[PDB]
Every structure is written in structure tokens, then in C-alpha cells.
Design a binder for this molecule. Sequence first.
Ligand SMILES: CCCCCCCCCCCCCCCCCC(=O)OC[C@H](COP(=O)([O-])OCC[N+](C)(C)C)OC(=O)CCCCCCCCCCCCCCCCC
Ligand SMILES: CCCCCCCCCCCCCCCCCC(=O)OC[C@H](COP(=O)([O-])OCC[N+](C)(C)C)OC(=O)CCCCCCCCCCCCCCCCC
Ligand SMILES: CCCCCCCCCCCCCCCCCC(=O)OC[C@H](COP(=O)([O-])OCC[N+](C)(C)C)OC(=O)CCCCCCCCCCCCCCCCC
Lengths: 70, 155, 50, 177, 62, 64, 221, 171, 87, 459, 50
Amino acid sequence: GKRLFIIKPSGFYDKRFLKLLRFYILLTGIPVVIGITLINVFIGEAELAEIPEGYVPEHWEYFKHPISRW
Amino acid sequence: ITKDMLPGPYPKTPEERAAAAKKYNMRVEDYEPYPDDGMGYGDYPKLPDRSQQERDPWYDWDHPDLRLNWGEPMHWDLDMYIRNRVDTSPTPVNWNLMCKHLFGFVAFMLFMFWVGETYPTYQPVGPKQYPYNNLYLERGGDPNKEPEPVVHYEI
Amino acid sequence: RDHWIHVLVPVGFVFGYYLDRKNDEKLAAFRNKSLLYKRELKPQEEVTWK
Amino acid sequence: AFLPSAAYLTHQQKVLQLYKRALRHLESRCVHRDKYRYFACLLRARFDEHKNEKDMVKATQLLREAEKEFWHGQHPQPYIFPESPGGTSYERYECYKVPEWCLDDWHPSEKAMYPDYFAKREQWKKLRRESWEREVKQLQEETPVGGPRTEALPPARKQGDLPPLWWHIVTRPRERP
Amino acid sequence: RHSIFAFTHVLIPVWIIHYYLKYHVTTKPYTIVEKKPRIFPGDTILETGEVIPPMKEFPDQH
Amino acid sequence: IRWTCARSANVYPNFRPNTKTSLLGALFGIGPLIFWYYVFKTDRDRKEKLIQEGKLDRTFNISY
Amino acid sequence: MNLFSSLTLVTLILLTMPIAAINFNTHKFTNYPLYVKTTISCAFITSMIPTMMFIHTGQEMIISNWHWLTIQTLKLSLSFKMDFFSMMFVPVALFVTWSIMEFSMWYMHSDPNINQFFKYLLLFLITMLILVTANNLFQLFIGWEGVGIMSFLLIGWWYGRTDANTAALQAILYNRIGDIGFILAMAWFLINLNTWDLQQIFMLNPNDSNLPLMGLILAAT
Amino acid sequence: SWDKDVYPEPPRRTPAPSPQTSLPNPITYLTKAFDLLVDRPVTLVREFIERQHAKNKYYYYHREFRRVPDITECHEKDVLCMFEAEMQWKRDYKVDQEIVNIIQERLKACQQREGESHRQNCAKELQQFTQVVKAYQDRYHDLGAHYSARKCLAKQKQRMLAERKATKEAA
Amino acid sequence: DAPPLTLEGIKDRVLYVLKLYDKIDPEKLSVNSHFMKDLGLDSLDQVEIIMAMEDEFGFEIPDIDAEKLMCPQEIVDYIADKKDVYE
Amino acid sequence: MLKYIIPTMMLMPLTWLSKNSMIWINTTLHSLLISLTSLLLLNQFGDNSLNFSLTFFSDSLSTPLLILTMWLLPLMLMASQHHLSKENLARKKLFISMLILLQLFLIMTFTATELIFFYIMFEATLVPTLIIITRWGNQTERLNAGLYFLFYTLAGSLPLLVALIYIQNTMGSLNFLILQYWVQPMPNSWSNTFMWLACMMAFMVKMPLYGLHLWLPKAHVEAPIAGSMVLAAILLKLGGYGMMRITLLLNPITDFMAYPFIMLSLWGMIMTSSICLRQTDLKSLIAYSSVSHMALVIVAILIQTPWSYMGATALMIAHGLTSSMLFCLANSNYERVHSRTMILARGLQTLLPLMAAWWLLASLTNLALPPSINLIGELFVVMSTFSWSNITIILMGLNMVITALYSLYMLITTQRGKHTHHINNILPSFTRENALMSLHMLPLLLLSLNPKIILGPLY
Amino acid sequence: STFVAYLPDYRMQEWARREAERLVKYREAHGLPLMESNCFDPSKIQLPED
Ligand SMILES: CCCCCCCCCCCCCCCCCC(=O)OC[C@H](COP(=O)([O-])OCC[N+](C)(C)C)OC(=O)CCCCCCCCCCCCCCCCC
Ligand SMILES: CCCCCCCCCCCCCCCCCC(=O)OC[C@H](COP(=O)([O-])OCC[N+](C)(C)C)OC(=O)CCCCCCCCCCCCCCCCC
Ligand SMILES: CCCCCCCCCCCCCCCCCC(=O)OC[C@H](COP(=O)([O-])OCC[N+](C)(C)C)OC(=O)CCCCCCCCCCCCCCCCC
């Protein structure tokens, strides 16, 4: 069907670089987002309460998110 | 590239002028430099100061996007004289006539706009009528101050 | 161990953190003495911060 | 004045180029076919009435008056063909004129995707690289002293020998890739 | 596979943005500030029950 | 390479300070600086003398 | 009351999904223009629903849904202002664009870079819809420069032809002069009204506001 | 939730939807579809996350700083107490900035929620915003990027001498 | 859009344009028939033919190449080279 | 700050004791470990700076600069690991040791609590850059590039040091945690005028100020690109740190004296933008753009408003990242074509698409496309300069046209048009190059989401 | 990115809301002004002579 050729520069290297970038960012992004939604669904975000009398808090007991506290 | 390939100082005598002309590989008489007024031009050839759209577009150039060949002594302002920049094409209309026409047109209708600003058009009507002292409270005025009661009268 | 050259910088960071933790000990001139952060030292405690 | 082969434009060539440009501007002036045909016949009859003039200086002055009225009576926006320079589609498809040597840079895992084409390319390259010394031998003895006097390339004078400097003029890709 | 577009590209964004807007944006004050609906004579507020009293009769001309 | 060398590196070695070059350098080097200095100066005194006397409206200007 | 904001943000996020779809591809996409066209048709329907709701009722909304920063007094947050204006203009633009991508499916079928072309005009539509529904002036500036850059790219599409490059640079120059006017108006509004949101600007109602109006006129020019 | 005094909002008055013509409207049907398909699974996953929240419920507390002697009772070139005074002054600076921010939030919310007649019903918010803007301009404006409690005290002193001079010259 | 043309298609086209010209008799024309030698026209008629071909194919031929191609076979060769036939 | 200095001084034997083929891998890995470790400096409070010890402190200002510095070292190591493959192994280790010493002196510069310590290591930084510029360049003019770079900067600061010593005889301490409370106002006199000049001119040269900017293009068109990136991205920021640490002591005489400096900076940034509009070399064009950006930063810190300080810090960090990645682009082009001419290699989008994408992103981030941090800083400086006076916006407005006009043009003639026929050595994208380009580009986009970490000491 | 996203309350900025959320809640319930033109106590300053 008169299938002609179009000369184009080799896109194998650019595609390989993009695949490597996406794989190497996803390899840690998937466990990080899985851990984030797991602590946000099971460990639980903290709650606001007033300071009790005679009991000082720790330096890490002033923040909301558990990751910030850790 | 060596010490006599890069451009040098101003050539004075015919012999060094011919040496500079064969340095740029052009005609000896057609190689003429800028006047030594102290601007630091040097022995660079002075092109007749035309743009690059004027070049032959059908000729098999060495560089087709620039219409420039190889080894030609190029313009002092090649960057200024690309197709994507200032163009010196021969216009069908005179340049001074173009400037005069544009200035006269712009000044004439700016003057007419200002004249119409002095004498405007309108409709044969009276002012609009609004209730409650021309909406004193709805304009944002304070309620602790009682406005002057102005009423609108029928006709 | 055939990877002795790869544990230079973590050892240096551990040594630097140990040096810093020794360094704030000499700066205990105003510990539990500031007019804004002062509090009574709790039982089963000896210092407010190490 | 500026030509790949010549250094001076003969007055006959200048007359023909004036006729071509003036009639193209006339066609761009009057759009319809009948008016264009009538005025084209009028212009051809005028050039025929001034055709029988063998005096060089008289045709010189007549050319000067003719160029002056042609520039005086030309359309500001003459019609330009879509592939001609100054046209709407001038060098538009040039973004896909990738040269052939980019196929040198291809990965070997993709060079096996089109095996016959790449084999043909390497045998073409072999043909070119064995013909290179023959063609530079052809120019090294046919060229006059002090370099060539004109830019017209010589042909191939022998059967089986490839044309000299044949590669980069025949290698340009199709205009619709 | 015929209705995979209308479920993945529509319904999951609705559920996600409604969860986010209901339990994370409405909890913050002055975030989704909505213009109050216009009140016309003869209407009735559902949350109170008080009826806006009827507007005076038109001095008709037509 | 000849043009790129003649554009930058071959300006000073074939430069001689005469009346034209020095006049052009003084005209285009210290002229606009003096003009902008004087314009911004008199704008500053006008703004300051407006703001010390309370005539400048600074009712809502609390971000600066 | 709750269908409104959810469906409108669904329209926006559904418009922004195919860009992330084409950015994370490992293969040649099978009929990417059909993907974009079907997505924009569903987005047109999803944005046509609150049009019917508003013309039935007459509701206007402000959705300040994501905080960005607080510097000194000023607070900037991701806020969408949807009134008669923006939320009425959006379905018209969605209909026109849906027809235009279908015509582009007809027209640009002979270009191997058709997917990049569709991605570019989808990005232009995204930043334009950001522009129309912007609440604070900064989001409107973001949409302004986004549509300017996308116009530059889509004019210099055929990068081989130098006339396209010259036209794109000329358009960039004139749009940057307009941005000079817009930035002057921005600076006057901040320096004299201590705000960038439209509500505070309309409430404070400055009197000697000839300079910001002149700047906005220059931006519109 | 949030406190209703710091963010006051008027009660909602929604008129009764009563059809005039016989043609039905799709808004009620789409509202029912939204309540069925969308709201129910969102409420289900919300009850899931809050039930998982109920097992581990620990608290965090708002930090409070006691009042310290200010910059006025500091001996000059004795850093050991003007450090605390400057610390308190910077904390109060941040608090005042957030106060002007919350007043701006109140004004914007009033202007949006009052519709097309906001120029009359948001007079109180405009007066409060003008008062707090004048207070902030007297308290903190023109200090410079290198602001300190000494510069603020000197500006307050200069303002006090200006006010006393205006009182004495118009007594 | 724009279907490729073979050499016999442009050959049919060029002989059609030649046969539609009044100065050419429709019997004595060939691919190698010289305009000044086989048929004996003028230079102006050659530029008329060049304009006819330019308007027929919808593209511009440069003036030097307009005057250089001097036979219908040269016209066929130039058109086939510029359109790059037999792909 | 001993938890980052000791890793650097302990990585020094690691690059001295490494094998003959694993120097680059070990140095890059351990420098990236230090780069991750450096994120602990963000323990910042809204009132008190993180004062580590007697001679080390780091407020909200210097922490982004430190993070930029020890994120910048691995990028320099990747960007300078191609052309040094034929260089001898001992000299390769010498080059890496010079880069490591430069990083160590830079991190010791930004955290020095005493101004004498800051000065001492701020021009202990002068030796490694001079060595790298003069030794590992590629032209003759590098020798001249070792003179104009040196004898400018020292000539600005050998007065300054004396002035600093005078403060040691006046206040009694040059510590910055003390001088925030012991500072006295500066009276109007000729002696205070010359003290202001001496305290200002060193970092005025190091920005550079217009008129004193001649050392910047002559030291950039010939450097090895590790030197080019450290000079453009982080070495110019020592002037900004000098401003934001020195201008506390120079009040209120700065307000009625910095008029000609602001005039020079504004009209010289106009001039250098115009010079960018008519350049032929990529390196010189990027250097003159850097001159324009630092003149803008000069105006921003000289008007001394809080909004201006936010904009100055944001513009400093964003311009450093953008100029470093632009120099990476120019180095890739000069690697492929073995020349610095702009008009030589054109139309590379037809051959290199991903480098064309990086060119487009670089040009977009150069002209302050929102919502990037470059636009944030530039906009804040624009509003602050409009607050200083009205007419300044005109002197900004033309620049904001011109700073777009070359920023695309420098792209276009390098990427768009008919490609050069007689150039055929254009290799495809090496993974190392594009990895370096993405490592430059992705933080610049990421910082737009959370700008509050790079908004100066008074956010 | 995960570290700087969950960084523990940069410069106490969120805290700057909460105490402010208390403070107006005080002074809108007792008729006190929102903020005063005097940053410090105007009765605890020795005014210089004029
Ligand atoms: C298809 C899969 C979909 C996802 C499925 C899984 C998730 C399901 C839904 C749950 C989501 C998570 C919980 C709700 C959201 C988080 C709640 C929360 O408090 O988040 C913290 C905050 C809420 O704001 P905030 O008020 O807490 O922020 C204050 C932050 N400080 C004080 C540090 C300044 O952030 C978000 O919620 C993130 C919003 C992300 C969406 C918006 C993207 C914007 C893109 C453009 C960026 C650039 C804009 C530049 C201009 C800006 C305007 C001027
Ligand atoms: C890049 C090249 C140009 C660099 C220019 C740098 C800035 C220009 C001014 C620098 C002056 C030198 C440092 C002075 C520091 C003074 C500190 C101070 O408190 O002074 C108050 C003191 C005041 O005296 P005092 O403090 O001893 O007196 C007691 C106080 N009273 C006055 C009340 C009694 O000033 C001086 O003593 C004189 C200061 C001016 C010095 C003039 C001579 C030097 C001129 C500039 C030379 C610059 C280098 C040129 C060559 C470059 C290389 C080729
Ligand atoms: C720093 C100075 C030196 C510079 C060089 C630094 C080198 C080292 C770099 C280390 C790694 C990077 C560190 C900085 C990371 C910054 C980013 C970050 O983490 O931000 C945190 C912020 C945190 O959000 P936040 O601040 O709102 O959250 C508040 C905090 N909590 C949750 C605890 C209440 O993350 C985000 O904002 C993410 C938002 C969601 C993700 C994006 C969704 C939208 C995506 C785009 C969709 C399409 C839009 C339209 C597009 C149109 C076309 C353009």
C-alpha cells in the first residue's frame, strides 16, 4: 500500500531515560503513599485538648500529625 | 587559526589592505573598512548595509535558513539582520509618505475624538429618579446620620 | 568486610552528632533558669533536657 | 547578477524576467480568468510591438521606463504560490526533514526491526565510500588551476563510475515525509 | 469495558472530591462561602417556618 | 570564528580615545543615570513632604 | 448545595486527568484524540449540570479549598470564584472546544506529533479554565501567563517555518506589555487596598482608582 | 469544627420550592441520585475511618507562653533580658498579623455572603477592619525589614511626642 | 489529500496543456520536441508555457530553471524530481 | 554544624583513598547522603534561630542556601565527569578535592556567627575557584579570567576587613547574636559615609554591581562547567548574605545614600538585558542575564522592606537553580558541537527532542512563569520597588519585556529552524546528561508547592 | 518531599492562628478593642520633656 519510510532520530534513549525516571520515582513513591494512607487510616490523627494541671507535655506533644510528632 | 587568521588593526597602505582583503577572501577594491573614528571597528569589511530577505531565495545556499554561504565575509550585524529581525525590504510605498499618512491619520482622529469629547451626544431626557433620598442607605451610608429628605416629583 | 570505604561518611556523621551532643553540655549556664520557660523539675527526673 | 553559474544577466533574460513578473502581478491584480486573459493578450501584444527593436541602447531605455511603470503600478500583495518563498506554507514541512545519518545513531535493538532497509543502507554507504576516492580523483584532474572558475559540477565521464559529489544533493528527503 | 470510562473517570473523582469537600474543607471555616438565596414575598423558610408577609397590592395601570 | 573574535575581543586593542568616542561614552554613560537620579530624587522629596504632613492617603497601606 | 462544588471540581479534575494519562505512558497511545474528545464531552455534561442548577436557583459560590501561604498580613489560597460569569462561560467554551478537537481529529490526522498537539491545546484549555474561575488576582495571573505561553507554543508549532517563530515572538512581546499593565494594576491594588481577592477590592471601593483602571485597560489592549 | 464567635455566620433562610408550572425539574432527581450513589459510600468510608480513629485517641495541646517583662524594663546593653522581651514581641507580632488576617477573612465572607447588596449589610465588618488596620498601621508599620522592639518603642515614643505636641498646641 | 502522481500522469498533463495551446499543433508534439527547433516558437511562447505549467501544477518554478528546461521531457523530469515520484 | 563539616572532611580521604574507577560513584553516593542529611537544618522557629553553638548558627535565611550548596555539589560532580576522563587520576582527585574544599568553605561561610569568621572563609572560598578557573579551563583568556575575577573582589574587601576590625574596636564584638541588640544608629558624616562604602563595596563587587560586572562574563565563557555552576548559582549569593548580615549595622545612613547604587543597578540591568538581546555566545548571554538578576537583588535588599527581603531570597535561590541548569544546557551544546556560537548549531528540536523540552522548561522558568518561585520572588521585588516609588515600575516594565525577548530568542535560534547541514556528530541523549537536567529541574518545580521554606528570615 | 510536607509546624505558623483564634475570642466577649495603637503599656513609659 505504498508504505513509505519516515526518517526520525532514535527515541530509544529518551524513552529509556523516561522509563528509568518513572520506575525509580515510583519504586519509593508507592510504598511512601501506601504508608502515608495507612497511618492516616489506622494510627490516626491527633485531637485538640487543653493542657492539664500539673502535667507538662513533651516537646513533640504539641503537633497534630503523627509523622510530625515522630 | 593563528595570529594572522583573527582580524587585526586598521590597514593603511595598499599592501596591507590587499593582505586584509585576501584574509577575508574578497575583492581588493570592494574591501573597504569603516572610518577610524575610534569606535574600535578594525579591519572588518563594510557590507553595503542591506537585510537578508533581499538575498536570492531560489539559489542553493550553503545555509538555507540564513541564505548565507561558506567563507563569505559576513555583516557586522548578522544577528541584527536575520529574517527574524529588522527587515530592509523595498516597500511599494514611499517610507516618508507612509510616516506622513500614519501620523496624519492618527493625529486627525485623535483630534476628532477629543472634539467629540468636548461636544458629546445624548438623549432628550431628564435625570433618573431613585426613591428614599436617592438610595442613601443602599449606597453604604451610615444609618445613625439622617440624610436630607429629597423627593422626586411627578409630572 | 570488603566494603570498608562505604562506611566513612555515616561514621563521620555519627561522630559529629556525638560531638554536638557533648557540645550542648558545656552550654548549660541557663538551664531551667529562663524567665519564660522555667518550670519545676519533676520527680523521677534530674535534668529538663540532655 | 547573482547566479550559481553565471556572473552577468543578459538583457534578454532581464526582459523575460520583467515579462514574467509583470504578468504575474497583472494576474494578481485582476482576479477573474477572462479579464486576466484579455490584459495578458494586451501585454503580450505590447511586448510584440516592441519586440522588433535590435538597438541595444533603445531597448535599454525602454526597459528602464518599463521597470519604472511596473514598480509604479504593482499590487502591494502579489499572489505567491503556497510552496514559493513568501508563501503561506513556505518551509512548513521542513520540521520533518531529518537527515539520513541519524539512522547511524539508532540502537541495535531497533536496527533489527527493519533488517532489509538497514542492509540496503549499509551497502549504499559502501558504494558511496568506495566511489569517494574515484570522484575526488575526477575533480582533482578536471578542475582548472587556481580552483574552478564556475560552480557548475562536471558529470560522470565513465560508465560504472558514479557522478562526482553526488551524495548530499541526491540525499535530501521527500517534500511530504 | 463499554462503561469503564463513565465509572473510572467520573464516579471515583466524585467520591474523592466529595470526601475531601465534606470532611476536610467544610470543617475549615469560611472556605466554601455561599451566597444566600434570594427571598421573595409569599415564600416560606423551611428551617424556621415563618412566612414573609404578603406585599401590598399593586396600584395597577394596565 | 573570525566574526565572533572581531565582535568582542577586537574592540579594545584597536580603540583610541578621541573626542568622538569620549563624547559618545560620556553622553550614553552618565546622562540617563543623572536623569533617572534627578527624577527619582524629586519624586522622593515630593512623596516625603506629602507623607510627613498627612496629605498622602495611607488609610489601608499596612503591607510595605 | 453539595452537588454544586463536587461536580464543578469533578469537571476540573476530569479535564486535568488526560495530561497525567499521557505523561505516564510506556507505549504508543491508541487513539489519544478519542480519549481527549470523550473526556471533554463528559466534562461538558458535568459542567452543564450546575448551569441548570444556577439558572433554576441563582446560587453563587466561593471555594477556597487549598491554603497556599500567609506572608505578613496577606493570605493567598487556592480559591475558585464561580458566579454567573465564569460558570456560565465555562460550558460554552467546553462545547466550542469539543467541536474544535473533533475538527482537529479530522484535520491534523497526517501529523505524527498529533498527541503532543492535543496535549498542548488541552493544557491551554486547563489554564484558560483556571483563568475564568480565578478568585484572587494571582490565580488570574497564573492563567494569564499560561494561556500566553500556550499561544506562543501553538503558534510556533511548525518550528521549521521562521514566520511562525517571528509571529510567536511578536505575540509574546505584546502580551508581555499587557502583563506590564496588569502587574501595575496588581501592585496598586496591593499597595492601596491590602488585598488581592475580588471581594475585598469590591467592598473597599477606592475613589482615585484611575491608575489601576488604566493598567487594566493596558492589559486588555 | 470551629468556634462560632471568631467566625460568625447568620442563620440560613431558604425559601420553599413550590412548582408553578407542571413541568418537572431534573434537579430533584439528580439530588436523589447524588444522595444514593455518592453520599452513602462516602459516609460509609467516613464511619470506617472514624471508627478506626476511636480506638487510638491521643491528645495534643496548644502551647502557651507566660507573660515576660517587656522591653521597657530592660537595662541597656544587657542582652539576657531584652532577648526575652524581643522574643515575646516577635510572638505578639505574629499573633497580631494573624488577627488582621482573620478580620480580613470575616470581611471577605460577609461581602460574598451578602449578595448584591453587601455595601449596606457589611458596615460593621468594614468598621472593624478599618479600626484593626489603623491599629496595625500605628503599631507596626514603617519599621523596616530589620525590625526590632527598640525601633517599635522609638516609633511609639515619637508618636507619643507628636500627640502631646498636638495636644499642647491645641489646648 | 494530494495523491502521488506517476510520470505518465504528469506526461499526460503536460501533453494536454501543450495540445490546448493554439500555437502548438496537436500532431507534431513529442517529449523531446524542441520549442525553437522542432516547432519554432519564440522565447515569449516558452515563458507562456512555463506560466501555464506553473498555474496548472500550483507551484512556482524559478526563472533560471524556467529558461533552462527546453523540452517537454525536461519539464517532465523537473516536475518528477520536485515531486519525487516513484516512492 | 559539626554533623555536616565532619562528613565533608571525612569524605576528603574517601575521594583520596578511592579506587581508579570508583571515584565518581563513591563521591556522588556519599554527597547525596550528605544532601539528605542536610534537611535536618529546617528545625526553625518563628522567633529564635537554631543557634547550634558559640560560632555556628543558622536562621531561616541561610538554611536554603546551605541545602542548595550541598545539593549542588553532586550536580557539579556529574556535570564535570565527562571531559576529565582523559585527565590523569591524581589530577582528577585534585579536582574533586577542590570541589569538596569549596563546598566546605561555603557551608562554613553561611553559618559563621562572627563576621570576622564569615569574611575569613568567605574569601578562603577565593582560592579553589581561582585554581579551577585557571587550571581546568579551555581557552587562553582563562589566564585573564584569573586576574579580573581576583583583583576585583579583593580590592572590594581589603577596605571592608579594616572596617570590620574597626567595629571590633567600637562595639566590642562582631557576633551577630549580640549585634542585633547592641546596634547603634549611624549619624550623617563623611566618616560614616566611608564606613558604609567600605562595608558595601565588597559585596557590591561580588554581586556584581553594574560597572563592576566586567569580571562575570570574562570568567564564564571559558570555565569548566563545575566552576561555571558554582560561580553562577551559589558563589554570587555571598553578596546577598553580606547584605542581609551587614545592613543591620548600617542604619539609617543607608536610606539617604543608596540612591546612586539603585540608579546604577536599575539602568545597568536594563543595559545588560539589552546586551543579552544582541549576544553571540550562550555562556556570555547567561552571564549577562545573571548580572541583570543580581542587579534586581541589589535593588531588593537596598530598599530594605520585608516583602523585598522575601522576594530577594526567593529570586536568589530560583536564579541560582535556573542559571545552573542553563549552563548545563550550554555545556551539552558545547560538548556536542565543540563551539560556543549560537548561530552555528540550529534546529536541534528536529534531532534532540528531550533537550528541546529541557530548553523550553529552562526558558519558561527564566522569564518568571507563574507559579514558579522565580515569579514569586520577582513579583515581590516588583511590588516592593513600586512601594519605594511609583516611576520605578516603568524602569521595571521595559526589562520585563526584554527579559522575555532574549529568553525565548536564545531558545529559538538554538532549537527552531532548519538544522545545520554540515554538522552530523549530534549524538542522542546520554542518560547521565538528562538525569542531571531532571535533578536540576524537579526541585525548581517542587518548591512552588511549598515556598514557605525559602522565604527568608522574616516569613 | 515527605519530610517537608509533614514538617512539624514551620515557624509555629499554624500556632499563630490558634492563639489568635483564642485572643479575639477573648476581646470580642468583653468589649475590648481588637488591637491598640500602643504596642506596649502607655502608662509604663517615662516621656521625655518637651
Ligand atoms: C484517583 C485517586 C484519588 C485519590 C485517592 C486517595 C485520597 C482520597 C481522599 C483523601 C485525601 C486526603 C485527605 C484530605 C486532604 C488533605 C487534608 C489536609 O489538611 O491537607 C493539608 C492541606 C490543606 O490546606 P491547609 O489549610 O492545611 O494548608 C496550610 C498549610 N501551611 C500552614 C503549611 C501553609 O493541603 C491539601 O489538602 C492538599 C491539596 C491538594 C490538591 C490541590 C493541588 C493544587 C495544584 C496546584 C499547585 C500550585 C498552586 C499555586 C497557586 C495557589 C493559589 C494562589
Ligand atoms: C573595587 C575598588 C574600589 C573599592 C572601594 C571601597 C570603598 C571606598 C572607601 C574605602 C576606604 C578604606 C576603608 C575605610 C574604613 C573606615 C571605617 C571607619 O569607621 O572610618 C571612620 C574613620 C574616622 O576616623 P576615626 O574613627 O579614626 O576618628 C575618630 C572619630 N572622629 C572622626 C569623630 C574623630 O575614617 C577614617 O579614618 C578615614 C576613612 C576614609 C579612608 C580614605 C582612604 C582610602 C580611600 C579608598 C581606597 C580604596 C581602595 C583603592 C584601591 C583599590 C585597588 C586598586
Ligand atoms: C530548598 C532550598 C534549596 C533548593 C534545592 C533543594 C534540593 C533538595 C530537594 C529535596 C526534595 C524536594 C524538597 C521540596 C519539596 C516541595 C514539595 C512538597 O513536598 O510540598 C509539600 C506540600 C505539602 O502540602 P501542604 O503544605 O498544603 O500541607 C500542609 C501540611 N499537613 C498535611 C501536615 C497539614 O505538598 C503539596 O502541596 C502536595 C499537593 C498534592 C500533590 C499535587 C496535586 C496536583 C498536581 C498537579 C495537577 C494538575 C494541575 C494543573 C496543571 C496545568 C499545567 C501546568
